[PDB]
Amino acid sequence: GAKAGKKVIVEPHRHKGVFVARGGKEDLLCTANLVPGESVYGEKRISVETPTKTEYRIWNPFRSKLAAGILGGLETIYMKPGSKVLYLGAASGTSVSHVADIVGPTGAVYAVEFSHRSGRDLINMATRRTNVIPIVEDARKPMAYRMLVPMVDVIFADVAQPDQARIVGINARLFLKQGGGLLISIKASCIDSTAPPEQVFASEVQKLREDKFFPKEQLTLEPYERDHAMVSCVYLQKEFEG
Amino acid sequence: PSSMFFEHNEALVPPYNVLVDTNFLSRTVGAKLPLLESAMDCLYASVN
Amino acid sequence: AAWPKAEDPALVQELLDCVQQASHYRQLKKGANETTKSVNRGTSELVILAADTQPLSIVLHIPLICEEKNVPYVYVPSKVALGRACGVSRAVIAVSLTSNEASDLNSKIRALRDKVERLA
Amino acid sequence: MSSLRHAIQRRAHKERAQPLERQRLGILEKKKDYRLRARDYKKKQAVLKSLRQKAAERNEDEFYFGMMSRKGPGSALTRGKGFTGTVDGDRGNKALSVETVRLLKTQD
Amino acid sequence: IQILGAEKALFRALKTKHATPKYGIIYHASLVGQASGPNKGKIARQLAAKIAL
Amino acid sequence: ELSVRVPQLPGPPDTLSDWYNIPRTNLTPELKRDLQLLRMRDVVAMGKQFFKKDNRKDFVPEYCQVGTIIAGATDGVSGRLTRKERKRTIVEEVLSSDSVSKYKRKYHEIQEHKKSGRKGYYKKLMAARKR
Amino acid sequence: PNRKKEQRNPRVKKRKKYEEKQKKLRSVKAVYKGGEGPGGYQGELSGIKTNLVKSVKL
Amino acid sequence: KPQKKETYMQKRAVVVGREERKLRDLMQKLTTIRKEKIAKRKAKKEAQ
C-alpha cells in the first residue's frame, strides 16, 4: 500500500486549492493544511521542506463523498479559495475540516451539526481551525441560526434526511446569494428504498428545480460508494458566479 | 449512465414513467382510445 | 441519553425477528468490536444497540460512528434477548446487520430502517 | 459461402523450406519476402528520382541566407579526401575564449 | 578560514566541479553585512586573511 | 510618526496565489528523472497495475513540489517504511524494491528481438557465404 | 466442423459469456466491488486525471 | 561528421558513480520497454 514516508510529489489540481499527490505506485488527493502538522482524525498528512512550515493532508474518498465526487470528476464545485461555504451535515467535521482547508484563512465555513457529541468533535475542530464556525442545531429550522449565518455562496449538503429537498430549499432561500452554487449528496436508499435509484435521482432533481434551482451536472460517485449521486446545481440563474 | 447494462435498462420497473408526444396523443384520441386504460392494457403495469 | 429508544408494540420483536433472519443468512456482525469494524468499513445496513447494558458508554460510543457514517442505529432494552435472538449462548449488547445486493432480507431492512427513520 | 465449405477446406497450406543442403545462401525468398524487398526498393528509388528532379531543374543562381551562414558542399578538389557532398552541421561545440577556459581549468 | 564550515557544499562543488561556496560563518559575522554582493565577496577574502593573521 | 518613504521602483509568475503558492519547479536532473519515472509509472507495475495513461507530450507540470508522507497513526506496524528503506528518492525506492531482475529480463528480450535480423545476422550470412 | 466444449454443454456456455460480458462491463463503467480494503486506504490506486470530466450535463 | 578528436570538455567531465550508474541503467530499461509497449498498443489500435 501507500505506506508512510514515501517520496511523492504534489501538483495542482484543476480546482483551486486541491492538489494531487502522485508518487511511485500511488496517486491520491490532498489539500493544504492550515494548522500545520496536526492531524484531524489520524488522517495521513504530507510534509515538505521548502527552500518546514507547509504541510498537506490527504483525504480518503471512502470517507468523504466530497472527495469521491472530485475523483469522479465533477465540473466545478464552486468553492474557490475565498468563497463563503455553508455546510449541511457536519458529521463530526472530517470533510468539514477538508473544506475548511480548501477555503483557507480568508474564507469561511459555517457548519450545521444536530447531534451533540458529533458536535463536540465539531467544535473541537473549530477550536483548532479558525475559519470554520460551528452551528449545532436543527438544520430543518434555519431560523435557528439566521442570526448566525451571513450570505454564503456555496452550500454543500450531505444530510441523510427524507425531506432533503425542502430542507435545502428553505436553507437556500435564507442563505444563498443570487447566483448560488450548491452540491448535494443523494443516498437513494435513504430517500426511497423501493425505487430504482436513477429515478430517485430524477425526482430529487425535479423537486430542486421546483425549489427554483437549475441543475447543471450530476454523477454517480460509483466506485467509491453504492447508490449515491452527487448533484451540482445553481440557485436562481444559469452561469455560476455573477 | 447508471443502471445501463449494454443497451438494456434494468431500472425500468412499474410504475412506468412514460412520456407523451403530441402526434401520439392526437392519433390516440383520434382512435378513440382511453389513454390510461389502453396504457395499463399494453403494459399490464401501473403507469404514471 | 438513549433517546432513540425503541418502544414496545412489536417493533422490538420485528427487530429480533430480522436479527435471527440475519444470523441465519450470515449477513450479521456481532459484538461491539465487530460492529465497530463493520460500520468503520461502512458495510452495515443497520445497527442495533442494547440498553440494559452495564454502564452504557459502549452503546453510547457506537452511535458516534453511527452519526458519522449516518447509519440507522436503534436502542433495544434486552441484551440477553439479543443473545437469544441471535442464537449465541451469550448475551450480546451490540449487533450490526449489513447489506447485500440480492436478498429479500434487504427489503426487510428497508422497511425496518424506514421505521427507525420515522422513529428518530 | 463460408458455411458452404469444409473445415478441411478451411485448412491451410504450409510453405516449403529451403533445401537443407543449401542453407548457406540464407532464407528461401517467397512472396512475403519479395514484396518487402520491392517495397523498400521502389521507395528508395523514388527518393533518388525526386532528388535528381531537383538537381536538374536547379537554378544555377539561387541565394538564401544560410549560404552566408553555413559551410557548403564544395567539391572533390575543395575538401579533398573527406568530401561527401552533404554539409556539415556543427555538433555544438565552439571556440572557448580565454577567461572561460581559465575558470574551467581552475575548477579542474 | 574563508570557507570555514561549508564543508558539504564545498566538497560537493569540488568533487563534481561546480562553483565553490564563497564563505561560511563569516557571512553571519558582523563586518560583512555592511558590504554588498560583489563587495561581499571581496570583503569575504579580505576578512579571511586578516582573521588568520 | 510620519517618515520618509523608501524608493524601490526598479514575466510569467512565480508562486501560485490560487493554490497557496506552490512554487515554480526548479528542475534538478533528479527531478527530471523522477518525472520521467512517474509518466512511466504504467510500466513500473509489471502488469500488476494499469493506470489511466495521462500522457501529454510535455511531461512537466509548471508547478510542483517534492514531498513525503508523514504518519498514519492508525497503521504503524507495516504502513511505514523502515529506516533502511526510507530512501531519499522515488527512483531509489523503485530500485530498492524487487523485480529489477524481471525488468532486466524483459529488457534483454527486447534487446534480442531488435537485434533479430538487423546487422550481426547479415554479417554471419556473408561470412558463411564467403567461406 | 469441429465444435467446442462450451457449444457442447449449453449451460456452461451460458456461464462463460456472462463473465466475459461482466469483465467488459468494468471496461466501460465502474462497479462497486466492495468498499475500501481492510488494510486501510492506500490511494486511488490507478491514476487520477484532472482533465477528465464524467459529469452528465442536464 | 563524427568527431574523432577528443575534445577538452570531454576530457574534463567527471567520472560517474555506481549509484548513478545503476540508476541510469534502470531508467534506460524502463524507457525502452515503454517504447515497445506504445508501439504494440498503437499497432493494435491501428488494427481495430
TrEMBL record, chain A:
Recorded GO CC terms: box C/D methylation guide snoRNP complex; small-subunit processome
**Any GO molecular function:** RNA binding
Transmembrane feature ranges? none
**Protein localization:** Nucleus, Nucleolus
The alphabetical list of record keywords is:
Methyltransferase, Nucleus, Ribonucleoprotein, RNA-binding, rRNA processing, S-adenosyl-L-methionine, Transferase
Indicate yes or no for the key word Nucleus. yes
Enumerate the Gene Ontology biological process terms: box C/D sno(s)RNA 3'-end processing; snoRNA guided rRNA 2'-O-methylation
Q: Which residues form a coiled coil?
A: none
Q: Which reaction does it catalyse?
A: L-glutaminyl-[histone H2A] + S-adenosyl-L-methionine = N(5)-methyl-L-glutaminyl-[histone H2A] + S-adenosyl-L-homocysteine + H(+)
So what family is this one in? Belongs to the methyltransferase superfamily. Fibrillarin family.
The protein in question is named rRNA 2'-O-methyltransferase fibrillarin
Q: Which organism is it from?
A: Chaetomium thermophilum (strain DSM 1495 / CBS 144.50 / IMI 039719)
Its lineage opens with: Eukaryota, Fungi, Dikarya, Ascomycota, Pezizomycotina
Q: Which residues of the full protein are shown?
A: 64 to 313 of 313
TrEMBL record, chain C:
Mind telling me which Pfam families this protein's record contains? Answer: Ribosomal_L7Ae (PF01248)
GO molecular function terms attached to this record: RNA binding
Q: Please, which domain of life does this record's source organism belong to? A: Eukaryota
The subcellular localization recorded is: Nucleus, Nucleolus
Q: Does the keyword RNA-binding apply?
A: yes
Q: Which Gene3D superfamilies match?
A: 3.30.1330.30
GO BP annotations of the record are: mRNA splicing, via spliceosome; ribosome biogenesis; snRNA pseudouridine synthesis
- Domain Ribosomal protein eL8/eL30/eS12/Gadd45, chain residue ranges per copy: 16-104
What is this protein's function?
Answer: Required for ribosome biogenesis. Part of a complex which catalyzes pseudouridylation of rRNA. This involves the isomerization of uridine such that the ribose is subsequently attached to C5, instead of the normal N1. Pseudouridine ('psi') residues may serve to stabilize the conformation of rRNAs.
Name of the protein in question: H/ACA ribonucleoprotein complex subunit 2
Q: Which organism is it from?
A: Chaetomium thermophilum (strain DSM 1495 / CBS 144.50 / IMI 039719)
TrEMBL record, chain E:
- The highest taxon in the source lineage is Eukaryota
Q: Where is the signal peptide?
A: none
What subcellular compartments does it reside in? Nucleus, Nucleolus
- Which family is annotated? Belongs to the NOP5/NOP56 family.
Instruction: State its role.
Output: Required for pre-18S rRNA processing. May bind microtubules.
Quote the protein name from its UniProt record.
Nucleolar protein 58
Q: What is the lineage of its organism?
A: Eukaryota, Fungi, Dikarya, Ascomycota, Pezizomycotina
Q: Which residues of the full protein are shown?
A: 319 to 371 of 582
From TrEMBL, chain H:
Q: Where in the cell is it found?
A: Nucleus, Nucleolus
Q: Which domain of life is it from?
A: Eukaryota
Family, per the entry?
Belongs to the TRAFAC class translation factor GTPase superfamily. Bms1-like GTPase family. BMS1 subfamily.
Question: What is this protein identified as?
Answer: Bms1-type G domain-containing protein
Q: Which organism is it from?
A: Chaetomium thermophilum (strain DSM 1495 / CBS 144.50 / IMI 039719) (Thermochaetoides thermophila)
- Tell me the classification of the organism that encodes this protein: Eukaryota, Fungi, Dikarya, Ascomycota, Pezizomycotina
